[PDB]
Design a protein around this ligand. Structure first.
Ligand SMILES: CCCCCCCCCCCCCCCCCC(=O)OC[C@H](COP(=O)([O-])OCC(O)COP(=O)([O-])OC[C@@H](COC(=O)CCCCCCCCCCCCCCCCC)OC(=O)CCCCCCCCCCCCCCCCC)OC(=O)CCCCCCCCCCCCCCCCC
Ligand SMILES: CCCCCCCCCCCCCCCCCC(=O)OC[C@H](COP(=O)([O-])OCC(O)COP(=O)([O-])OC[C@@H](COC(=O)CCCCCCCCCCCCCCCCC)OC(=O)CCCCCCCCCCCCCCCCC)OC(=O)CCCCCCCCCCCCCCCCC
Ligand SMILES: CCCCCCCCCCCCCCCCCC(=O)OC[C@H](COP(=O)([O-])OCC(O)COP(=O)([O-])OC[C@@H](COC(=O)CCCCCCCCCCCCCCCCC)OC(=O)CCCCCCCCCCCCCCCCC)OC(=O)CCCCCCCCCCCCCCCCC
Ligand SMILES: CCCCCCCCCCCCCCCCCC(=O)OC[C@H](COP(=O)([O-])OCC[N+](C)(C)C)OC(=O)CCCCCCCCCCCCCCCCC
Ligand SMILES: CCCCCCCCCCCCCCCCCC(=O)OC[C@H](COP(=O)([O-])OCC[N+](C)(C)C)OC(=O)CCCCCCCCCCCCCCCCC
Ligand SMILES: CCCCCCCCCCCCCCCCCC(=O)OC[C@H](COP(=O)([O-])OCC[N+](C)(C)C)OC(=O)CCCCCCCCCCCCCCCCC
Ligand SMILES: CCCCCCCCCCCCCCCCCC(=O)OC[C@H](COP(=O)([O-])OCC[N+](C)(C)C)OC(=O)CCCCCCCCCCCCCCCCC
Ligand SMILES: CCCCCCCCCCCCCCCC(=O)OC[C@H](COP(=O)(O)O)OC(=O)CCCCCCCCCCCCCCC
Lengths: 505, 72, 96, 46, 54, 713
């Protein structure tokens, strides 16, 4: 019963959501630039900053709704396309349907849009995490950094082009574009003074991997003049070229997606970055690297043993889990948890295009939401109690019961209880790893889910429980409606996304 | 027996020695709707409930309900 | 800091002007001057700070209408999948 | 799908019936449990 | 017990009190963060009901 | 505008419409297709007569047509689908449908109203319907949602509201469980319910949320629920005048429902969910005193052990799923024998699949049952309030391993590791716990170590392999441990949170009910002759196997643990109540004031006393029912779904002289130990010589009485 109307509606929605976002950004920027001689906030109720905040927030939200609709359309379209290809067996018949482009808006960068489930999951993560982070950075943007209110819209545009393009060069350029806005945010919006050095560490560490990926892309393009991302099927790389490409790609993308030993920059940036921008960083900016690695390694044929890469990922997991215990700083502890989860996700992609990709994608989604939750809780703790250290913070529950309850339920979700996408992803990864190498699976599970879990839970329990006798005049009240609903939405997604259609998982 | 009672701040939403005057109506309006919800859940779930045969019943091997092996 | 205007025109702020009274006679040479504004916020009676105090049916109506639409849409979709203009209800339904 | 248990004879079935056994038979959902039932929808409306 | 004090006479028995959240019940700011999050929740639920359920 | 006039007109219209419906039904039955010939006759007189005499029918049909038109328009608007069957114009459609009266052919207003009224009649429900469709799920959901919503809405439900709501829910749940207990245990009734497709766990797999109410599940479920009802009733008195009573009550309810879900789990995913839930809720109960960080240390210890057990259980479930592409408990039980011959290639050793799976299961079971080595958390878990301690230590937290073994018995029957490990560890734990409890000085610690010893005995019984004996032991231990825990909780509350009986003395008069209740509960719990708790140990020793290589150590440890019960029971009872007054003067003086003398005078709660009494009575009744079901000559227990027969019942039905005299050794050991704890003097007293004289009198009188009974008659 599938008809061409659904196909064209899916394509039109995907193409036009990008232009909706672009036009909203363009209009907001034009207003901001042409309303004032100097693009800074006027400290009065009639400032354009209120309008810009409104436009950004409710452009992101409306585009997120449209993205939900377009993602559902894509799911239907892809399922029916697979059915059309598979069902017909007559030799004379073949599925050759050609679609003609619309005459209303042009194809950005003269590229035909191609959409995949992983790309749309990444885009949805971008939308949600950007919404959370923009909601967080309101107290940080003040009177000289208001120009960074459009940073998340720029991120959304970049990610949209990144995930809706079938061109290797455009893919790489979109991947590389993410550095400037993030660095500017960390440099100009971070309150702490150590953020100045944290930004430089972030830039250098990420740019080393960017250079590695650039070398890999140069190898691919120079050897194969193609750029369509699909002509690589008709060209085979020799053993030496293939091993060089895979090594460069893995190391370069692991520089971004933290892997052992390249997580010093991640720890520094998470500790010294804005509480609202750390959410976006951990949730999304480390998964574009995973998506790029998946695309490139599945496009290229590799005839090398992945034991070294698996060992690197497992070593990173073990290192982070062991170090979890010794962190009295909640933000650094959450950063180590992010390192652990990212390393597990990366390990999920070490078997080419096998079924591990499904578990990797689900774990990426659950890790995004869980890291957003944890960093938001740390942000609330730091903002209401003027410290994020365990020694200075204790007995949160008895003065802010909602915050303590959120901490406890965050710990429960992090533990990986059944009924959560976290548990589902763990089940996928461990079920595969048991047959791949059962002893390695046992070691990984033991470490991560006992030693790292205990180290993680010690600090959070000690902070939540106790008796806050110190500084009674300065104690806070409770979570606000915004924070409470953000936490509730994170929990609701983590719980209900397990009912998503199992066709794609 | 118990600890001596001490004042609790009004602004703080905590359960220390909380007693509600309208607890009777609160219980009435929290019990019955929960019972209706669980009745709905139970009647929905009974559609997928399985029971073994009764005392005087035996399962015919050739009946459709009898287990069937996969046919290649 | 906050730069919004307190004095809104959408509605008049509830207030009580009798709790605090400004002295206007019998002053001394060491007493400070009184305060010009002495109005305090007055909450509506029966307001319970510990719950949402929501008395509207909009959310319930929206959720119920959404559920009813989902039900009818599923019925139509099942009919379409079965290739019928409407569901063909069977005489007996068994557990499954 | 094919029968998994070993087969039995109709004479054996008749013998069991004479002995007094009964053949297990699934029973239809009662009006209350059946979701396509006027009783079910009356309950929903109430 | 020997000297139990009734609730009507015990001055330290608490009735339900406290503020649910940190938001001011009487706030003159046209704040919209709560409205935005409520809209997000409602639209997510509506999309699930009207596109996915069944 | 009068209500009376409106009602009269409505009644008249109803009667007229009913009469018209009956007339039309008769005329249609007579004129199946020819009724229009008379109804729509061209004659104006006939047309007017029909319209006037069927006006209620015509107006009803007009309203129905309007409603159907609007409903069809709404559906078309919402679904972008088709037309109103056809594209008929509004006027044509409405006229046609109003003129058409065949819609009333089978409709009678009185019959329809009677059907609507009887739809909700409650006389129709029958025991046959209840047996066909269990309401256990309905009542369990009632309890669960009650607990959840009470937790969320604490302000709405004060202390009394929370108590009453949860009491009603739990009472309904317990009554339903009691009704189905008789059927499940004896009538061979078990149910497999499914709520839906919970989650996707593979490329095309999706595990459903299913529950299995079988004999194995019900044995734990009914015990836990019965203990929990009375623990709940008792808690409102134990935590009397405490700042947070609702929190404790809701935590207890949460733990109860978590354990019920664990025991009545239809698949390994639900089993793991219940495992984690019981771990988390036990952590919360232990850390109830959130303000103190000392309690947090014990809570974190228990949390660490629970997480280790979760790791082992998860790894075992992963192995099972990798071997068989299925997570159903019944399917695994009925398939494991096929794969028994398989092995798993690990790092450098080819481990037997059954052995490794059973190893992980037994490790998790020992961790959660507090066996030797992994029991370190149980003594520290006593920081919880006495109701929570009783619930966790009686049948809820420390029986998870026993439940796992019973449910997955077909796996362990083919496990070499289980055969070697269960008896040795069980006996060692029994001996260790028994001796430590005997030497213990604190009431809660003594009960905890006694619980450890009974867990060891349960492990040894399972090794023996008589599931009926294991179930009987579990029931007896749970009931009487809970009762003793409640009694000692009352004692501690009277003694002002001082749990050591070195400061307890002469409490018999101040807590009369507690003294006798503790006497009965302890004589039943500690295996003593002529008590309900003697038979569990007797059956354990009957079923003990002798092919073990470490049989000497196993048997010696079992004997020592069994005898250890007497010492701890005697010490606890005597020191708490009838020993010289050792406590602070204030404890006695504050209660001995003459002003307190009244009909209402009591140091405990009337509700507490009634709850303890009812718990003891119901425990006696249920234990007797189980004994009749299993140990009677006519075996009437339901199927256990196990094909392993141990032959242990042979020595219970037709014991030989060898075993009959062998049991006498343990009987006389217990007798000598009783004589020691009774007549042995450790302090100088005015009654030393008279006590020695009484011992001599008792010895000589016993000898003469035996002589007369056996020979002289
Ligand atoms: C302060 C919060 C702090 C949070 C931050 C911290 C977070 C972490 C820590 C957490 C713990 C601390 C906080 C807890 C204490 C809070 C204290 C407090 O605020 O107290 C006051 C708070 C509010 O009370 P109130 O102020 O007196 O009254 C509020 C207004 O009067 C109410 O007005 P109304 O009566 O008009 O209600 C409006 C609307 C309420 O509006 C909403 O809540 C909007 C919801 C939008 C959708 C969002 C997704 C929801 C996902 C499902 C969960 C439902 C929400 C319930 C809460 C979560 C569950 C506990 O009500 C409904 O109609 C309810 C139906 C909702 C169902 C919507 C389904 C959407 C589709 C979902 C996916 C598909 C499902 C398929 C199912 C198939 C069939 C089985 O106390 C409560 O009443 C607590 C309610 C708890 C939930 C139970 C009641 C709802 C049950 C719904 C049905 C489900 C049950 C079984 C169904 C079986 C048949 C299907
Ligand atoms: C293990 C972790 C556990 C964590 C959880 C622990 C427990 C937590 C407990 C505490 C928190 C949750 C429970 C309490 C939440 C608060 C409930 C509440 O009542 O609060 C009051 C809260 C505050 O009240 P407020 O300050 O007065 O604000 C009011 C709202 O702004 C606005 O209200 P309004 O009165 O102005 O009404 C607005 C309503 C407006 O409603 C209406 O307009 C409905 C009535 C009109 C019907 C249409 C008629 C048209 C023709 C005209 C007819 C004549 C006029 C009729 C109308 C007359 C007026 C009544 O508009 C909407 O709702 C728009 C929604 C539209 C999209 C979705 C629905 C439609 C779907 C598709 C429909 C298709 C078919 C229909 C086609 C229609 C034709 C095109 O209000 C609400 O309830 C708002 C809803 C959202 C509240 C927050 C939801 C949070 C939920 C959290 C869930 C967490 C789940 C986690 C699960 C974890 C599992 C592991
Ligand atoms: C465009 C793409 C997207 C773009 C991005 C969009 C982003 C937007 C944001 C939102 C995210 C959207 C993502 C997409 C979502 C897709 C949804 C969708 O398609 O919907 C349709 C999806 C499938 O629909 P369908 O297949 O199309 O429908 C046709 C099928 O024929 C229907 O038939 P069916 O058979 O398939 O039915 C399915 C469902 C039908 O539903 C039912 O029948 C309702 C059953 C309700 C049962 C309630 C109680 C169960 C537990 C008690 C059990 C034992 C009781 C006592 C036993 C005593 C016996 C002795 O049945 C089940 O699944 C049964 C499962 C029952 C267990 C549920 C709870 C398990 C525990 C979970 C724990 C997780 C949180 C732990 C927290 C820990 C503390 C921090 O349906 C649903 O949405 C089902 C939702 C059901 C919700 C269940 C309520 C949860 C209760 C939680 C209780 C936990 C208590 C606390 C735990 C412990 C705390 C300490
Ligand atoms: C060649 C064509 C070029 C087209 C250029 C487009 C020009 C855009 C100019 C924007 C001016 C914004 C201020 C207008 C005056 C507001 C007055 C006011 O507050 O009164 C309340 C009145 C009415 O309020 P109300 O109380 O009636 O609320 C209902 C609101 N509506 C009518 C929208 C349903 O005006 C508004 O509420 C309008 C709000 C405008 C700001 C919206 C911000 C969200 C993001 C969109 C911004 C626009 C970008 C383009 C669209 C998105 C991308 C496709
Ligand atoms: C981890 C180090 C610290 C972090 C920084 C990362 C730097 C290193 C990044 C990875 C580089 C690739 C290493 C693996 C190469 C595997 C293939 C190989 O060489 O095997 C012999 C290969 C494979 O041989 P083969 O035997 O498999 O098959 C071909 C055999 N013949 C030719 C005989 C037919 O042989 C060759 O053809 C030689 C290729 C050598 C290439 C070495 C230089 C690479 C230069 C580009 C990358 C530079 C990145 C620098 C970044 C900045 C550093 C500060
Ligand atoms: C559709 C089907 C039904 C849908 C329902 C879904 C329900 C999902 C779960 C909801 C959990 C709600 C928790 C509310 C907690 C409120 C605060 C509280 O209790 O006090 C905190 C107490 C004290 O709170 P307080 O007194 O300071 O403050 C109370 C008032 N507030 C919070 C608003 C300020 O603090 C603590 O020490 C933390 C204790 C946390 C205990 C959590 C136990 C949960 C146990 C649940 C068991 C469920 C079993 C499920 C079995 C089946 C599984 C499939
Ligand atoms: C050698 C023959 C073969 C068998 C080998 C085993 C020999 C017997 C070993 C018995 C060990 C008993 C240890 C009990 C420890 C109790 C500790 C306690 O709670 O405190 C003391 C409690 C008293 O507690 P109390 O609170 O009243 O006061 C304590 C006072 N202080 C601290 C000063 C000690 O009970 C006793 O005092 C009784 C124990 C001591 C007497 C033991 C007599 C043993 C008789 C053995 C008879 C054997 C019959 C033959 C067959 C045997 C084999 C089948
Ligand atoms: C032996 C059990 C002892 C403990 C029982 C505790 C109570 C359990 C709950 C009652 C029984 C429910 C299952 C009924 C099964 C059934 O349909 O059984 C079938 C019968 C009808 O008979 P038939 O379907 O066989 O013809 O159902 C009815 O008669 C339905 C009438 C209502 C029954 C009670 C409903 C309870 C739910 C809440 C109602 C709230 C009303 C409004 C309040 C404001």
């Amino acid at each position: 019963m599938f008809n061409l109307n659904t196909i064209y509606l899916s394509r039109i929605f995907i193409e036009f959501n990008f232009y909706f976002l672009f036009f909203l950004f363009l209009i907001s920027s034009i207003i901001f630039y042409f309303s004032k001689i100097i693009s800074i906030q006027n400290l009065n109720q009639n400032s354009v900053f209120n309008f810009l905040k409104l436009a950004n927030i409710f452009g992101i939200l409306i585009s997120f709704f449209i993205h939900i609709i377009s993602f559902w359309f894509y799911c239907i379209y892809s399922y029916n396309l697979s059915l059309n290809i598979f069902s017909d067996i007559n030799l004379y018949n073949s599925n050759s349907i050609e679609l003609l482009n619309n005459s209303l808006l042009p194809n950005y960068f003269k590229s035909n849009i191609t959409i995949d489930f992983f790309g749309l999951i990444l885009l949805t993560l971008a939308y949600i995490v950007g919404f959370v982070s923009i909601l967080a950075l309101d107290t940080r943007l003040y009177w000289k950094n208001i120009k960074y209110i459009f940073s998340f819209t720029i991120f959304l545009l970049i990610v949209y082009v990144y995930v809706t393009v079938s061109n290797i060069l455009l893919f790489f350029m979109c991947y590389e574009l993410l550095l400037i806005p993030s660095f500017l945010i960390v440099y100009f919006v971070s309150p702490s003074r150590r953020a100045i050095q944290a930004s430089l560490y972030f830039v250098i560490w990420t740019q080393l991997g960017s250079l590695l990926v650039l070398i890999a892309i140069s190898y691919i393009i120079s050897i194969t003049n193609t750029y369509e991302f699909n002509d690589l099927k008709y060209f085979n790389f020799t053993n030496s070229e293939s091993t060089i490409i895979i090594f460069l790609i893995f190391l370069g993308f692991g520089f971004k997606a933290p892997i052992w030993p390249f997580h010093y920059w991640l720890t520094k940036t998470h500790v010294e970055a804005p509480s609202g921008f750390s959410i976006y960083l951990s949730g999304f900016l480390v998964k574009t690297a995973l998506y790029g690695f998946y695309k490139f390694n599945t496009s290229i044929f590799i005839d090398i043993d992945s034991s070294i890469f698996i060992a690197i990922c497992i070593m990173g997991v073990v290192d982070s889990s062991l170090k979890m215990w010794g962190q009295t700083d909640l933000k650094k502890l959450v950063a180590y948890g992010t390192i652990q989860e990212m390393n597990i996700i990366y390990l999920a992609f070490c078997w080419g295009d096998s079924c591990a990709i499904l578990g990797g994608i689900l774990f990426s989604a659950t890790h995004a939401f869980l890291s957003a939750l944890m960093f938001f809780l740390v942000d609330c703790i730091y903002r209401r109690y003027h410290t994020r250290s365990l020694v200075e913070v204790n007995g949160i529950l008895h003065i802010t019961p909602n915050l303590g309850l959120s901490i406890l339920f965050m710990l429960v979700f992090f533990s990986g209880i059944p009924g959560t996408i976290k548990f589902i992803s763990e089940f996928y990864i461990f079920s595969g790893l048991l047959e791949a190498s059962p002893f390695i699976c046992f070691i990984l599970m033991l470490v991560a889910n006992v030693l790292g879990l205990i180290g993680f839970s010690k600090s959070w329990f000690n902070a939540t429980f106790g008796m806050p006798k110190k500084n009674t005049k300065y104690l806070p009240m409770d979570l606000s409606f915004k924070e409470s609903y953000i936490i509730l939405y994170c929990f609701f997604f983590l719980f209900i996304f397990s009912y998503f259609s199992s066709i794609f998982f | 027996g118990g600890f001596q009672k001490y004042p609790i701040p009004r602004y703080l939403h905590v359960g220390q020695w909380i007693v509600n005057k309208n607890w009777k109506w609160n219980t009435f309006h929290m019990f019955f709707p929960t019972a209706i919800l669980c009745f709905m859940v139970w009647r929905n779930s009974m559609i997928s409930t399985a029971k073994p045969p009764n005392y005087g019943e035996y399962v015919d091997p050739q009946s459709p309900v009898a287990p069937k092996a996969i046919k290649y | 800091r906050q730069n919004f205007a307190k004095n809104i025109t959408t509605t008049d702020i509830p207030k009580d002007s009798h709790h605090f009274a400004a002295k206007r006679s019998g002053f001394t040479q060491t007493e400070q001057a009184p305060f010009a504004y002495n109005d305090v916020y007055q909450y509506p009676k029966d307001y319970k700070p510990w719950n949402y105090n929501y008395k509207g049916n909009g959310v319930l109506l929206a959720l119920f209408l959404g559920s009813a639409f989902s039900l009818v849409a599923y019925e139509r979709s099942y009919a379409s999948k079965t290739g019928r203009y409407q569901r063909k209800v069977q005489q007996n339904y068994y557990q499954i | 799908m094919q029968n998994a248990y070993p087969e039995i004879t109709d004479q054996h079935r008749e013998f069991l019936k004479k002995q007094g056994l009964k053949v297990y038979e699934p029973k239809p959902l009662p009006d209350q449990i059946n979701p396509f039932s006027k009783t079910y929808w009356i309950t929903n409306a109430f | 017990d020997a000297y139990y004090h009734d609730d009507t006479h015990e001055g330290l028995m608490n009735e339900p009190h406290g503020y649910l959240t940190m938001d001011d019940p009487m706030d003159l700011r046209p704040n919209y963060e709560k409205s935005a999050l409520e809209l997000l929740f409602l639209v997510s639920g509506g999309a699930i009901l009207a596109l996915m359920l069944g | 505008f009068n209500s009376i006039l409106f009602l009269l007109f409505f009644i008249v219209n109803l009667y007229w419409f009913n009469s018209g419906l009956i007339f039309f039904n008769s005329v249609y039955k007579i004129h199946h297709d020819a009724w229009t010939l008379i109804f729509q006759t061209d004659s104006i007189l006939n047309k007017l007569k029909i319209y006037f005499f069927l006006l209620p029918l015509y107006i009803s049909s007009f309203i129905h047509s309007i409603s159907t038109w609007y409903y069809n328009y709404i559906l078309n608007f919402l679904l972008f689908s088709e037309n109103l069957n056809t594209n008929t114009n509004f006027v044509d459609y409405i006229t046609y449908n109003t003129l058409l009266l065949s819609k009333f052919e089978d409709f009678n207003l009185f019959v329809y109203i009677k059907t609507l009224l009887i739809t909700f009649d409650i006389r129709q429900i029958n025991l046959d319907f209840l047996n066909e469709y269990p309401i256990i799920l309905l009542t369990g959901l009632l309890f669960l949602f009650t607990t959840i919503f009470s937790l969320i809405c604490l302000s709405y439900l004060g202390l009394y509201g929370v108590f009453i709501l949860n009491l009603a829910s739990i009472l309904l749940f317990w009554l339903s469980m009691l009704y189905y207990f008789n059927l499940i245990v004896s009538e061979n009734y078990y149910y497999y319910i499914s709520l839906g497709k919970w989650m996707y766990l593979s490329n095309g797999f999706r595990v459903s949320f299913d529950l299995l109410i079988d004999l194995t599940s019900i044995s734990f479920s009914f015990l836990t629920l019965t203990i929990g009802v009375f623990v709940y009733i008792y808690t409102f008195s134990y935590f009397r005048y405490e700042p947070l009573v609702e929190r404790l009550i809701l935590f207890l309810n949460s733990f109860m429902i978590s354990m019920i879900l664990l025991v009545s789990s239809g698949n390994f995913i639900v089993l793991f969910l219940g495992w984690e839930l019981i771990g988390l809720t036990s952590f919360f109960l232990i850390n109830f005193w959130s303000t103190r960080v000392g309690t947090l240390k014990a809570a974190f210890k228990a949390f660490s052990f629970n997480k280790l057990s979760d790791l082992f259980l998860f790894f075992a479930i992963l192995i099972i799923f990798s071997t068989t592409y299925n997570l159903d408990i019944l399917s695994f039980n009925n398939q494991i024998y096929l794969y028994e011959s398989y092995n798993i290639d690990m790092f450098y050793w080819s481990i037997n699949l059954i052995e490794i799976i059973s190893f992980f299961f037994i490790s998790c079971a020992f961790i959660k049952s507090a066996q030797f080595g992994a029991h370190i958390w149980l003594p520290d878990s006593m920081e919880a309030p006495v109701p929570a301690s009783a619930l966790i230590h009686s049948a809820t937290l420390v029986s998870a391993g026993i439940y796992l073994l019973l449910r997955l018995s077909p796996l362990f029957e083919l496990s070499k590791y289980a055969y070697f490990i269960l008896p040795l560890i069980g006996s060692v734990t029994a001996f260790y716990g028994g001796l430590v409890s005997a030497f213990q000085s604190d009431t809660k610690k003594t009960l905890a170590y006694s619980t450890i010893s009974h867990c060891g005995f349960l492990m040894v019984s399972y090794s023996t392999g008589v599931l009926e004996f294991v179930i009987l032991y579990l029931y007896v231990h749970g009931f009487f441990k809970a009762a003793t825990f409640l009694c000692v909780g009352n004692v501690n509350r009277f003694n002002r949170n001082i749990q050591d009986f070195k400061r307890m003395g002469g409490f018999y008069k101040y807590l009369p009910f507690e003294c006798l209740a503790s006497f009965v509960c302890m004589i039943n719990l500690s295996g003593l002759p002529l008590t309900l708790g003697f038979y569990i140990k007797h059956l354990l020793f009957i079923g003990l196997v002798e092919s073990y290589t470490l049989y000497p150590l196993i048997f010696s440890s079992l004997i020592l643990g069994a005898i250890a019960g007497v010492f701890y029971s005697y010490r606890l009872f005597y020191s708490i109540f009838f020993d010289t007054k050792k406590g602070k003067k204030a404890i006695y003086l504050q209660a001995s004031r003459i002003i307190l003398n009244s009909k209402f005078y009591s140091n405990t709660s009337l509700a507490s006393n009634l709850s303890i009494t009812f718990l003891v009575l119901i425990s006696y009744t249920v234990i007797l029912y189980l004994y009749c079901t299993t140990l009677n000559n006519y075996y009437s227990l339901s199927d256990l779904k196990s094909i392993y027969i141990n032959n242990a019942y042979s020595y219970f039905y037709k014991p030989d002289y060898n075993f009959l005299n062998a049991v006498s050794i343990l009987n006389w050991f217990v007798i000598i130990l009783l004589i020691s704890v009774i007549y042995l003097n450790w302090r100088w007293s005015y009654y030393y010589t008279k006590s020695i004289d009484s011992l001599s009198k008792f010895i000589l009188f016993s000898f003469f009485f035996f002589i007369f009974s056996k020979y002289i008659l």
